[PDB]
From a paper:
The 26S proteasome is composed of a 20S catalytic core particle (CP), to the ends of which two 19S regulatory particles (RPs) are attached. The cylindrical shape is formed by four stacked heptameric rings, with the two inner ones composed of β-subunits and two outer ones of α-subunits. The multicatalytic properties of this proteolytic machine are provided by the subunits β1, β2, and β5. All active CP subunits are initially synthesized in a precursor form with N-terminal propeptides (β1pro, β2pro, and β5pro) that are autocatalytically processed upon CP formation.
The pool of proteasomal complexes isolated via the FLAG-6xHis-tag purification on the β4-subunit also contained [name]−1CP-[name] complexes in sufficient amounts for 3D reconstruction. The copurified complex was resolved to 2.4 Å and represents the first structurally characterized native [name]–proteasome complex isolated from yeast cells. In contrast to previous reconstituted structures, [name] caps only one end of the CP in the [name]−1CP-[name] complex, reflecting a low abundance of [name] in vivo. Similar to the [name]−1CP structure, the proteolytically active subunits in the [name]−1CP-[name] are all autocatalytically cleaved and no propeptide remnants or [name] is encased inside the complex. In comparison, the other α-ring in the [name]−1CP-[name] structure, which is not capped with [name], resembles a closed-gate conformation. An overlay with the wt 20S CP structure shows that the α3-subunit is poorly resolved compared with the other subunits in the [name]−1CP-[name] map, implying high flexibility in this area. We conclude that this effect is mainly caused by the association of [name] with the [name]−1CP. Furthermore, α4 and α5 are slightly shifted away from the ring centre.
Author numbering:
A (entry chain J): 5 to 205
B (entry chain B): 18 to 250
C (entry chain G): 7 to 56, 58 to 76, 81 to 135, 151 to 208, 212 to 246
D (entry chain H): 1 to 196
E (entry chain C): 17 to 244
F (entry chain A): 12 to 251
G (entry chain F): 1 to 49, 51 to 138, 141 to 233
H (entry chain D): 18 to 45, 48 to 127
Amino acid sequence: SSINGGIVVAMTGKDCVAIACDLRLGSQSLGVSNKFEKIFHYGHVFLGITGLATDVTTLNEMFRYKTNLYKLKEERAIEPETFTQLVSSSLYERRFGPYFVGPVVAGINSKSGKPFIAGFDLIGCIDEAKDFIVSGTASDQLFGMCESLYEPNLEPEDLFETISQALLNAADRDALSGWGAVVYIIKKDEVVKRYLKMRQD
Amino acid sequence: LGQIDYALTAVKQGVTSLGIKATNGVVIATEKKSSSPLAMSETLSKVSLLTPDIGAVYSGMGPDYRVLVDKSRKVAHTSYKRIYGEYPPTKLLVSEVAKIMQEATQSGGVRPFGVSLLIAGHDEFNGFSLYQVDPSGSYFPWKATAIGKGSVAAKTFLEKRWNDELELEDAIHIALLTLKESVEGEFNGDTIELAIIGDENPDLLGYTGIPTDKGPRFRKLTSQEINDRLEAL
Amino acid sequence: GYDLSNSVFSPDGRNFQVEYAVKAVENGTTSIGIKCNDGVVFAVEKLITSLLVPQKNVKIQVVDRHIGCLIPDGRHLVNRGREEAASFKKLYKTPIPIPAFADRLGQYVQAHTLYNSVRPFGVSLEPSGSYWGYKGAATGKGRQSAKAELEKLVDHHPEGLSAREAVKQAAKIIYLAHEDNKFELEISWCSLSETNGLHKFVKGDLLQEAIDFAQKE
Amino acid sequence: TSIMAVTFKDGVILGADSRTTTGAYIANRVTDKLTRVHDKIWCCRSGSAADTQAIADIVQYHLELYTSQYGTPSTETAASVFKELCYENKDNLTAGIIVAGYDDKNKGEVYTIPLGGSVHKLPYAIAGSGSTFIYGYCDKNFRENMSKEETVDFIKHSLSQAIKWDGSSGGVIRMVVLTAAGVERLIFYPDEYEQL
Amino acid sequence: GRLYQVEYALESISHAGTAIGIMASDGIVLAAERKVTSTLLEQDTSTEKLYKLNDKIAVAVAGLTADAEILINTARIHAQNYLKTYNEDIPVEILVRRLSDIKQGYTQHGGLRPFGVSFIYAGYDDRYGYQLYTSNPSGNYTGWKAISVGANTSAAQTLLQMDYKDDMKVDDAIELALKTLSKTTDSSALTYDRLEFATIRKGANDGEVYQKIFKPQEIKDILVKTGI
Amino acid sequence: YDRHITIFSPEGRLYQVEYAFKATNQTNINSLAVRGKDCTVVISQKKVPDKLLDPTTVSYIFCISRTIGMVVNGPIPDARNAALRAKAEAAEFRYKYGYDMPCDVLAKRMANLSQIYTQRAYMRPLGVILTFVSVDEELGPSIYKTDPAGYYVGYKATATGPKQQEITTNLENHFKKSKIDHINEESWEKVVEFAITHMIDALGTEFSKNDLEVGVATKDKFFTLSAENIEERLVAIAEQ
Amino acid sequence: MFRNNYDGDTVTFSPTGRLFQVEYALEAIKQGSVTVGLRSNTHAVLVALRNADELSSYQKKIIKCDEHMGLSLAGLAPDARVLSNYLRQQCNYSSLVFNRKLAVERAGHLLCDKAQKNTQSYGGRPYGVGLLIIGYDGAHLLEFQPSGNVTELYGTAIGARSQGAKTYLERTLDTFIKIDGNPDELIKAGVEAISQSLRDESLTVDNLSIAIVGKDTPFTIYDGEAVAKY
Amino acid sequence: FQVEYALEAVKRGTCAVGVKGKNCVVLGRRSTLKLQDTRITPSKVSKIDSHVVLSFSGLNADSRILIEKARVEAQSHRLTLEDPVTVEYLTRYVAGVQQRYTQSGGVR
Amino acid sequence: FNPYGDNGGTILGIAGEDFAVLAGDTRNITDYSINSRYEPKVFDCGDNIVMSANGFAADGDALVKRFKNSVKWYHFDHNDKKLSINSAARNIQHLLYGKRFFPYYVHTII
């Protein structure tokens, strides 16, 4: 882990969520790709994975497999909480052989309508927070920026600015991140994806 | 004719049992048979809880049902729970039970189970549901149904009685009338076993402090409640 | 139809395969066991066919230095009992008690009556796996005369019998049982006094004395 | 830990301290190191707590099965079971056990299973980290036949010295007496044995 | 060298419900008839005879339900395995051949009853476009333009042969399927509660929404518009 | 095939378990189990016609655990097999769950084993009844009976054997008269006397100290009475 | 006519307690040729007498199991091969683990134990060969039947009109029992015994095989120009 | 019988002809129905690999298994010996597979 | 725990025209102590074949016993074929390579 770089941050607003990530992929100091997206979505739930890129791709494929089978069997899209439990169980199934990843789940429950964000450790310990979740090689800078900037009950327009500023300023202080950023603003029925202009790229 | 037809005959020779689904719940009812006053009826249960929201009743060979209840309880945790952190919906649990019965039918050197199951349950995004599982391994949803010995007359009465606006109390009343019309011996609260899948009961959870955690929807009526209901017939 | 395979219950609730095994047991030679004061004596008849060495055809066997016992079925049972006794000794560091050994043998024999894929034993511990404690035990072709003699001995000795006289009584009973047919006698001993509680074969002068006493009777 | 078991005229007496330490910190000060594996067969455990507890539970299960099948096991049988468990898994266990019991053999019986799984039968045995300081004393104040009160006093003096000179031993002194009358449990507090 | 078990399975299928699949120049239409009625049996058993294997392939069933469920679960697992392995949707022919091989294996080894189920596959891929297949217990799969399985196979085949064109539209195929079913059922008239419908069509925008399974209200509206 | 193996007959029957019910009566021994307010009594016939037998080794009563006892009707090999299995299960339960196995749980385990025997073709049923008795920590005096068909249930009182019908009828009449579910006798000796008197009245015969076998379950443990205790109980009965 | 309902498998008892398959396996020995076994106090010999046609060789009847023990067979050849291989393995184990030559009585016990397993298994078949085992020095002689029985005899004969040899041995027991120190005379006595079992058939250097083992004499097989009565 | 009935089932299959010449080999369909799509049709002549081709006669479903096994064996031989399979080796492998399937009961 | 040891000794095999010679020490030692002053190292396995394994005494004894057992079973299975010296060498090579990853710690001269 910590050889490819990458940072993801999720925040909860008023009837909406935001999830942003960097785009750098590299082999230690050398930069390889500036288009390596680390955010995926199944149904209406979004997942960001930091750490080893191979494990990120493997987990994305496995979770797409499981979510498609779930939709076929239950005739219903999976909710963020059930997906969080599934991810935690899958991560714990690899005890002593863990995937070197940091996962973060975001989304709005279709039925209840409230936002939901959560994070996972190496072996699938669920960390549910009502304000923000951070992951990556710049987690300390992300924690500082989120603690300084975040406010409860933010409109999507203000939430986008807050999360973008936090991500950009955290990435500018990390050597293994900052080759482009992408932000998802997720509402009850509409999702907006935006690319950010930043230095070093 | 094969082993499945013989198991169906054995089911037809068993005690009746019923099942009625209303708009806001499901009612299961059956009669306990023990032609021995020395034996204690309370030690034997014919309605078994599978999950806090799913219960089952049977007609046929008792020991087979006793083994199948334990198998279903184990499979409700091994397969769905401990993965998604919640109890399975009624359809998936019924499918797993039908898979168990199908494997019993198809396995060599093993005879099929001689029971038919009526499974009642509730789940989110699907409401209340009632299903019947045959010894072969095929399950069918029902609005109101009966099995066992006097199943033909019970089915006729249910067809003449069931409608779309039926409520839980009306379903209980109809089930009690159907049981009374075909009771083999003695019709009182100690010989009737009735359960309902309905509203969540916070007083049966056992603890307080978690607002999201709700009580079970399965509720087994006591002898006193059954006697009070019979006093209203 | 019910008697053509093992582990099949007849309409009255019987396993005719075990009954046929008992019939096979009833065709065997006589074996006698006498429970004296602090000891047991075993006696065996051995038919002579011809060119046969008169001394080495031993039918008596010992388990764990302190237990005495279709010949190949009996050999198989004795081997399994020896394995069980060795397992008990290794687990608990003490010689296996006689009731424990009998219970393990009974369980092993009853195992061979549960499946139609195996044949019940045809030895004597009955072929059904049943067993009990006895003051005197008789099996074989001439078992009824031996049972009558043992009942006579029990009536005549309400306070117990000595091992030394029990050997001679066993020899006499064996000769009386063989009297029906028209042979060698093997005797084995296990007593707390003359053997210190270890199973032994009684031969030499005492064997000759027992043979002479039986012949004079 | 300081553990001992001594045979006297009416049976056997087991004594132990009540201190369990994680490094230099006392995790438990009311530990009960006297474990019952049969109605009149008890064991004293030293070493790893998990290993000793697991071995005691397995021995208790085996002895219960033996009682169900055969009757009343002897103390030598329990010692043999302990020896088998310790010797088969010597590479993954750290347990020193003293097995003391009263039966028809009379005068009590004591067996020792030290590290490695060996078996030694002794009139009296001491074990634990605190026993090293009370060896010579116990060799100068032991007699083959003693009464109950004298044996209790001997145990109290030995364990008092062991607690005094060993920092890994402390707390209250717990004693178990196994006689034909049954099982007796005795507690001696620091205000009592710190003087005599 | 006839196979008696396969013949028995085919005879059993001949007594099952009738399914019709019609392929047009811009879509595929699947229809099925519900036969079981008890005045108390629930009709919300998800979809009784029409099933989705993925976002691109659908199947119509004629025969025993348990074998159908087993085969459909296996097909779904195979499709997801292909998607995970190659990051692309599985071609229809590959999945059809996989299921046909499973059936053939079940018709060769002793101790296994052949699957008494007939499948009608309707799929779409970028190699051949729209594809329609039929698979039987014998293990053979055949492509078709308009096919029917179940009870009145011969009459439905004749009716389709009379009134099929190579350039029909999706609505034309829907009307043809409805009229063919209405003229072959032994229940006088065709009703919405006894019918299951599905369409696989691609619009002007390359979205490929191949999951349109008709609701009972939609089936009733289509029947009213057609005039059945 | 349907007559020799455990499969359904065209009438939906099981003509290998009913034969086991027939085999349960190979012996001619009648057993009676009653329960007091703080005890449970089991009495069984003991027949030793042979003079070469050792009467001490003839018994149909087993001590499964400290508090649970069992009485078996049927052949002794199956009885001892079931007793060994029950003892092993009780020991395993104690090792696993850390507390003593209840009587009803053991009966349910044995009934499930019997059901497994009935459902698998290569295994034959055991022709035994396996009446378990105990004084439960939560329930109290409890009697639970099984059968080769896998069916088990608890009883206030029960009787087994070829002549069980008369004993059952007398018990039913007595419990109808008393209108209570047990026998009102604080001491278990009185309960044993009542059971012996009931068996004498039902069978219409007298017993000596060598014609009966008694087992008593209390809160402390379950134990089998010796011949001298049976003789003293018979003397106490004869005194009134 | 007279159909037997209890001779199908080896796991069914006759109503009188018989095992017909075991008896048939015993009768299978009569198919094989004649083998004769003697025993003195210092030596033991075996004499064995088939040829498919004039252009074929002769079947081997004597098999060496170790340097001090051997056997002869009558009946099914593959069963004899399996039993001889098992006995060789047992002797090898005894010589390797304990450096101890296996006793003949223990070998007979092992053969009986192995043969017993085929009479109770179902789906198999009992052995169809009878064996004559001879050992070192005192000298020993065993007769093994497929039923699982050993005898420890002075002498015997098995297979294909062997009753004449057996009667001759019963007559001349006291004569041949004490020919200690002269193996050749014991061999000649065995030759006369096997000649007593021949219906006018002659003995040549192609049909006769001999085996000898005694004190200071390892197990030795004579065939060909070595059985010319030299 | 089992082999004879298999041969009878073979006799009901579509005709197939194979001819060899000086430097070439020539390998030689029923009447399709009016509603049958022939755009996607499994050709009766399946190439096992770039130099060996196969043509079946009999049951098509059972021939698919043989074709798949032959292709897998050819690829395995190519990966194991670096040399593409010969004609006789592949024919012997197919014959061995069929002979193995004839035994062990062999209903078909 | 070290499963290997050294016991000293030396052996010498010389092949002539119609004869062979295998000579060896008789001293068995451990470190600086003499275990035995007379322990033969050269044996006679039969068929005019002599083999000596020098080094670890336990491995040498095991190899000698295994080779003699192989020779006796070869005589059993091939009608006393009188195993040749080159065949014996090949068989010993197979025996030694059988324990490729737990090798005999000996030097063999035949």
